[PDB]
Amino acid sequence: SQTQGIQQLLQAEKRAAEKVADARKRKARRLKQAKEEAQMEVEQYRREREQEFQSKQ
Amino acid sequence: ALSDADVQKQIKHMMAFIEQEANEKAEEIDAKAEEEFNIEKGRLVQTQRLKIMEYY
């Protein structure tokens, strides 16, 4: 494996870098999606709370 | 002179378990992505819940 092993190492380590980048982008995407969905849940329940306060008024 | 047979043995074994452990590490990062997703949605917006509930 004088040279062939080096090439296969290069390819496999490129694939490992690619999956690490994929996982990192997955973390960032899920962080953004979590923030967005949790916010939207917050405002829709704000709407229902405001309706309850309208009824109480 | 172990030659191409042992070259293929070393290549297939090493790259195989590299790709395997690579995949499980990525999937574990995805599992922790699920964990931080749920924790954020139940903690940060939940402190927001407490603030707004006190406000109301």
Added chain:
Amino acid sequence: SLAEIVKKDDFVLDSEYLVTLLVVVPKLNHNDWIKQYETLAEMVVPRSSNVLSEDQDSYLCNVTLFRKAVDDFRHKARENKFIVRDFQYNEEEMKADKEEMTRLSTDKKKQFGPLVRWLKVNFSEAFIAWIHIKALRVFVESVLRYGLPVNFQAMLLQPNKKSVKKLREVLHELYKHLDSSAASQQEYYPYVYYKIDC
């Protein structure tokens, strides 16, 4: 350390699992090494039977090996009369040492010029003051020999070898009339004497 023998290409580059050990093998069992380097260790680089350079005791050669393979290869090659060495390529280890060698030699010569000038000069004045203190002695001993008055006449001399004793006895004959009694003359000669030799 291998200055003009080993270089970068010999050792493994960007190594993830391997380490290149410069396992020197003599020609007495070189075919042995290239044939059973697999027996020496499992999980080894195929076609790693590479020889770098030559020397009078043996032939330098290197083996690329996983970590456990390095342990096993060392373990079963120390008994195989192979020199073990986990050298790390370092151009600085060569360039530094050679630079200090040449610079220190040149500066040592440039400062040794002053050494010889200073040394020969200072020794010449040292010998000048040397003969001066010797003359001061000659004066003191000649004076006290003849009492207060400082009237005396000094002289260099150079006796012939093997004619020394004849000169001793004729000068004893000459100077024994000054005192006319005893000047067992030995060290304190009937003349005020001092000795010097180069």
